[PDB]
């Protein structure tokens, strides 16, 4: 099993929400084996890939977070070498590494706003309302297809702070009504 390789970012740089591929299939395959990745990394939200899976990962106060169901127990490739997991919790579906060289980090939310925004692998910013600790209702029903591959991605409050990490979609008859996420509180207890 190779290392997770950062293959793009979801950009909230300026006044538009958009994804950028920064590596291709073959070169990803090459980098996973060794774990040595020179590539220019930027930003808070990374697109990350394994041999079979592509998903998201979000840096929040110096730690890159994602889902175990995506990342398994794998290292993540870095300029120096494979980077071992800092945090690992299979029940929470959570893994964390040190935040990558080049990254920015989001700040945990302190607002307690319930208006939230899920950022997807397609670079859509989808509005969500807080349902409670770890659930949030989409204002606009989507098929599961649409959200698939956006695990590891942030739910942001209106200040652009992180509320949590997208974990799963609450679906009936193929339609996501709500989403499940790992709250920052739970990260900050995991830390
Ligand atoms: C729509 C996008 C959605 C974010 C995505 N997540 C999933 O697909 C998860 C993974 C798996 C099933 N998922 C679901 O979302 C299901 C599904 C019907 C399939 C939508 N929904 C669901 O259970 O609803 C129940 C209320 C919630 C209860 C919570 C479920 C538990 C979460 C979960 N935890 C663990 C911990 C450890 C494991 O060890 C290997 C494995 C796990 N697997 C898990 O669920 C995603 O995009 N992934 S991804 O990016 O495509 C892939 C590359 C990584
Ligand atoms: Zn906030």
Author numbering: 989 to 1179
The authors write:
The HCV NS3/4A protease – a chymotrypsin-like serine protease – is a prime therapeutic target that cleaves four known sites along the virally encoded polyprotein. The NS3/4A protease also hydrolyzes two human proteins, TRIF and MAVS, which are part of the innate immune system, thereby confounding the innate immune response to viral infection. In this study, we report that four chemically representative protease inhibitors – telaprevir, danoprevir, vaniprevir and MK-5172 – exhibit distinct susceptibilities to the protease variants R155K, A156T and D168A. To elucidate the underlying mechanism by which chemically diverse inhibitors bind to the wild-type protease and drug-resistant variants, crystal structures were determined for 16 inhibitor-protease complexes. These complexes include wild-type protease and resistant variants R155K, D168A and A156T each bound to telaprevir, danoprevir, vaniprevir and MK-5172, with resolutions ranging from 1.10–2.50 Å; S139A protease variants were used except for telaprevir, which requires covalent bond formation with the serine 139 for efficient binding.
The most potent of the NS3/4A protease inhibitors is MK-5172. Against wild-type protease, macrocyclic inhibitors danoprevir, vaniprevir and MK-5172 exhibited antiviral potencies in the sub nM range (IC50 = 0.24, 0.34 and 0.11 nM, respectively), while telaprevir potency was significantly lower (IC50 = 1030 nM), consistent with previous reports. The acylsulfonamide groups of danoprevir, vaniprevir and MK-5172 were also positioned in the oxyanion hole, hydrogen bonding with the same set of backbone amide nitrogens, as observed previously for the TMC435 and danoprevir structures. Meanwhile the Nε nitrogen of H57 interacted with the sulfonamide nitrogen in these complexes, suggesting that the Nε atoms were deprotonated. In contrast, MK5172 adopted a novel conformation with the ether-linked P2 quinoxaline moiety not interacting extensively with R155 and D168, but stacking instead against H57 and D81 of the catalytic triad. Notably MK-5172, with an ether-linked P2 quinoxaline moiety, while protruding from the substrate envelope, stacked against the catalytic triad, avoiding direct van der Waals contact with R155 and D168. Unlike in the danoprevir and vaniprevir complexes with wild type, in the MK-5172-wild-type complex the P2 quinoxaline moiety did not stack on R155 and interacted less with D168 and the electrostatic network involving these residues. We report here, for the first time, a novel binding conformation for MK-5172 in which the P2 quinoxaline moiety binds far from the S2 subsite and instead stacks against the catalytic residues H57 and D81. MK-5172 has a unique barrier to resistance, as neither catalytic residue (H57 or D81) can tolerate mutation. The high potency of MK-5172, for example, derives from interactions with the essential catalytic triad residues, which cannot mutate without severely disrupting viral fitness.
